[PDB]
Specification:
It is classed as oncoprotein. By secondary structure, this protein is an all-alpha fold. The chain is built from 12 helices and no strands. Helix 10 crosses helix 11 and helix 10 runs parallel beside helix 12.
């Protein structure tokens, strides 16, 4: 897989124009049927969000190859994140109709997409979570699949945000144990953290777990403070 000097940056940093150069490079390298340059009117960040089914739909003849070729480029050398603006930090479950519209305007420049008419999703965030991927495709044939997968990553980073708040709340907890503790509380970060702090303080005291629950509640969840009292008690 010998890519040209201008396509040797990681695909995540490809511009819209880079994507088009990569398509013309691929069709001549593998004798693929010619594809239209506008079939992937997006930058590298959006390209990496597409599924393999999205590639098949956009290109019925060379989509499969294109996707696998993209994966062979990703295996060559290695974290893309969604830099959400401050007004789009509320979870989509609480998005308004105007929040969805700003989300579309932000997405268009962030992924170098074709213009998305504001009227494409005349709805609040609560209705957006019920739309299927095919509804996204219908409403925006140029970018609907990107927009759907973008929404899924926003919904997934909230859970990972919660896992990190748990593990980094007390030392000694692995990333898996935090996710395990978070699922036991049904997603309650505050309860998962409280359970971890009670367990660590219970391990250091010869007293009951309920006694460890009240000491922490008094010390306002300062495990170090509550550990100092327990350690001094005989």
């Amino acid at each position: 897989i010998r890519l040209p000097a201008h396509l040797r940056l990681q695909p995540i940093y490809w511009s819209r124009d880079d994507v088009a150069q990569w398509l013309k490079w691929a069709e001549n390298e593998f004798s693929l049927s010619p594809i239209d340059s506008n079939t992937f009117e997006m930058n590298g960040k959006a390209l990496l969000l597409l599924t393999k089914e999205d590639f098949r739909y956009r290109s019925p003849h060379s989509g499969d190859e294109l996707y696998e070729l993209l994966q062979h480029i990703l295996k060559q050398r290695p974290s893309t994140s969604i830099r959400l603006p401050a007004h789009l930090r509320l979870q989509p479950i609480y998005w308004s109709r105007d929040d969805v519209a700003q989300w579309l305007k932000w997405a268009e420049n962030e992924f170098s997409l074709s213009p998305i008419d504001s009227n494409t999703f005349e709805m609040n965030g609560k209705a957006l979570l019920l739309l299927t991927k095919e509804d996204f495709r219908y409403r925006s044939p140029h970018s609907g699949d990107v927009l759907y997968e973008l929404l899924q990553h926003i919904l997934g980073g909230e859970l990972q945000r919660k896992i990190m708040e748990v593990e980094l709340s007390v030392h000694g907890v692995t990333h898996q144990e935090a996710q395990t503790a978070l699922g036991a509380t049904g997603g309650d970060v505050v309860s998962a953290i409280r359970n971890l702090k009670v367990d660590q303080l219970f391990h250091l005291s010869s007293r009951s777990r309920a006694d460890a629950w009240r000491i922490l509640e008094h010390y306002q969840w300062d495990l170090s403070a509550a550990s100092r009292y327990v350690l001094a008690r005989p």
